[PDB]
């Protein structure tokens, strides 16, 4: 109907949808529907049309009255939806419309103090991250719009892929757990007895411009790592050929898989056909290099968010340091010398060389990050954390010499 721009039955079904979601007790999507209804309406003081009204209640109704009513229940939903950024935004425009258009200062105050309450909830409340499972459809007998398509679902907040399998497959007798996640089935593309495949995929973050260079707490980072996303990665490994069991990191290729969808979660509906696919894979060299790079990003963010809170979360950060030392000193770097600091790592390819000096400068950056963590732990030490600190600092020193003389990593 949207395509055929018949706004009226459009609205009719939009309200059918809000009722349907209510009976489903889903609130974010119900709010989203309510918005896309509302965004038809404008801030003109002219009650231009009664046709846009549902036939429930009408008096004179300048459009702004209806818009603000809509916003009242919409912000109510976003509240009970326990998702807030869009709510506080809608509060921004509702507040400005009040203040410079109708001057109903009691409402100004009510909504703005509620916006403040929402701010504190943002900080104080926990946000579980729903996981995103990719659901292909293959088989003859589906509804036509459910055939040979990938629907990735924002599942429940504490719900794991197997439980989603329960939902879909108890939802579908003729259940099939067709395990080859990657390929469709040409036979099944018109064979009945429908093939499913399901697997978690990982969201591409909603990088908000101008927020990278700020004292952003973890709150903003999680809120945008789990919501208003469009792309979702999924990685699988490759290992064939040069079969050294010591460190296979010359043929440990991995095959990430990302997708692009037409619109953005969360939406009026909690799934979507896939509208574009990112088929990809990389040689293990660049792969592990990016693993190290993202690890440096990890602890960099850790120290920056930590560079302003004294009684911040202590023990898990110390545990990140422990993982830096206990498993990674021997194993996580044995590859650094064998798989990398050997001549074979160049006879793989004369094409590029910034590889190994790049990882060397990365570890060169890495160590001062650990100095930072070491001293801030020196503030964070507990009765048992001094000996752990001293032993990890002994390892830290020996790694100083390993990077500087053993690795040959340039000091700077």
């Amino acid at each position: 109907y949207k395509e055929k721009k018949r706004e009226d039955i459009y609205i009719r079904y939009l309200y059918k949808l809000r009722d349907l979601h209510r009976d489903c007790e889903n609130y974010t999507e119900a709010a989203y529907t309510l918005l896309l209804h509302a965004e038809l309406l404008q801030w003109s003081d002219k009650p231009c049309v009664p046709h846009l009204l549902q036939r429930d209640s009408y008096y004179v109704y300048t459009q702004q009255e209806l818009k603000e009513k809509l916003y009242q229940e919409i912000i109510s939903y976003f509240d009970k939806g326990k998702m807030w950024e869009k709510a506080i935004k809608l509060s921004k425009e509702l507040a400005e419309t009040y203040e410079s258009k109708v001057f109903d200062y009691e409402g100004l105050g009510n909504l703005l103090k509620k916006r403040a309450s929402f701010y504190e909830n943002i900080i104080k409340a926990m946000r579980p991250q729903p996981e995103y499972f990719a659901v292909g459809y293959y088989g003859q007998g589906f509804p036509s719009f459910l055939r040979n398509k990938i629907f990735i679902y924002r599942g429940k907040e504490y719900e794991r892929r197997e439980d989603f399998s329960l939902r879909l497959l108890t939802q579908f007798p003729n259940a099939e757990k067709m395990t080859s996640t990657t390929p469709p089935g040409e036979d099944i593309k018109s064979s009945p007895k429908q093939y499913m495949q399901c697997f978690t995929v990982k969201p591409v973050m909603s990088l908000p411009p101008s927020y990278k260079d700020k004292p952003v707490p973890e709150q903003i980072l999680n809120y945008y790592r789990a919501n208003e996303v469009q792309q979702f990665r999924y990685s699988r490994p490759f290992r064939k050929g040069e079969k050294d069991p010591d460190n296979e990191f010359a043929t440990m290729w991995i095959e990430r898989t990302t997708y692009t969808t037409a619109y953005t979660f969360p939406g009026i509906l909690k799934w979507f056909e896939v509208k574009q696919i990112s088929t990809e894979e990389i040689s293990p060299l660049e792969n592990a290099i990016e693993t190290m790079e993202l690890t440096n990003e990890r602890i960099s963010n850790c120290v920056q968010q930590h560079a302003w809170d004294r009684s911040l979360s202590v023990h898990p950060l110390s545990m990140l340091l422990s993982g830096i030392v206990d498993p990674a000193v021997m194993g996580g770097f044995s590859n650094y010398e064998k798989a990398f600091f050997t001549e074979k790592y160049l006879q793989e390819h004369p094409e590029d060389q910034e590889k190994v000096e790049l990882l060397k400068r990365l570890i060169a950056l890495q160590m001062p990050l650990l100095t930072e963590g070491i001293r801030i732990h020196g503030e964070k030490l507990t009765e048992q954390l001094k000996p752990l600190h001293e032993r990890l600092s002994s390892c830290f020193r020996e790694l100083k010499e390993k990077v500087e003389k053993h690795y040959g990593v340039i000091t700077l």
């Binding site: 926990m126 504490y158 719900e159 964070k380």
Partner: protein, 239 residues
């Protein structure tokens, strides 16, 4: 199916601080995992804490029913049931009726548990409940003039908690006294009393009957036909 990830997605909660989000080992006893829970918010003193079944159950899950937790629920962490119990009976000795009131409400909420019942046993406070119900109805008489309904609620909560503890059976069964039947008589021989105190008194009567015989003779010396029928005049089908 029987092996999941031994760590399972239940957000963990602690007063004041954030409810933390992680998976929690099913293959590690509830002292090392409690220690890690504490240290997660940068906290210590795990040894005086207890994992509450943070629904209305309020139960304290042991490693037997550790397997019964599923992913994604609420798990509040109040101090160890031994700590709560010693504190609670400590507030029960409190001459201030308000501290006894709050401790007793907590006791009524918590006695439904069997584990907490066992720690309450091992602190032997059941004896304290015995002597206090059997004496305070005759001791506080001066302020009892006013606190007849106050002691009504106190007796009500006390006896609800007591029967919740008692019914589990592992408790012995001379844990009454002659003063036990005396306060029974102070219920069943004077004017109308609170319905719930009477309910729990009758419940102890029947449990005592379940136990042995000469105890039933004991209650028989305080049995008159025309007292138990006025409880038929109580038209509540429950009573």
């Amino acid at each position: 199916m029987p092996p999941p990830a031994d760590i399972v997605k239940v957000a963990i909660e602690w007063p004041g601080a954030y409810p933390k989000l992680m998976e929690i080992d099913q293959k590690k006893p509830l002292s090392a995992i409690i220690k890690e829970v504490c240290d997660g918010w940068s906290l210590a003193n795990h040894e005086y804490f207890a994992l509450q079944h943070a629904d209305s159950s309020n139960f304290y899950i042991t490693e037997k029913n550790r397997n019964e937790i599923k992913n994604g629920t609420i798990l509040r962490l109040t101090t160890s049931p031994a700590q709560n119990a010693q504190q609670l009976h400590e507030r029960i000795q409190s001459s201030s009726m308000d501290a006894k009131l709050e401790a007793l409400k907590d006791l009524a909420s918590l006695s439904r548990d069997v584990t907490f019942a066992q720690e309450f046993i091992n602190l032997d406070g059941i004896s304290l409940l015995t002597q206090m119900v059997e004496s305070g109805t005759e001791r506080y008489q001066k302020l009892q003039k006013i606190m007849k309904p106050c002691f009504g609620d106190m007796l009500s909560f006390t006896l609800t908690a007591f029967v919740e503890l008692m019914d589990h059976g592992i408790v012995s069964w001379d844990t009454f006294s002659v003063a036990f039947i005396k306060k029974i008589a102070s219920f069943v021989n004077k004017s109308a009393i609170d319905i719930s105190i009477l309910q729990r008194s009758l419940a102890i009567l029947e449990s005592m009957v379940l136990n042995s015989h000469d105890l039933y003779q004991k209650v028989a010396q305080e049995i008159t036909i025309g007292q138990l029928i006025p409880h038929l005049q109580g038209s509540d089908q429950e009573i």
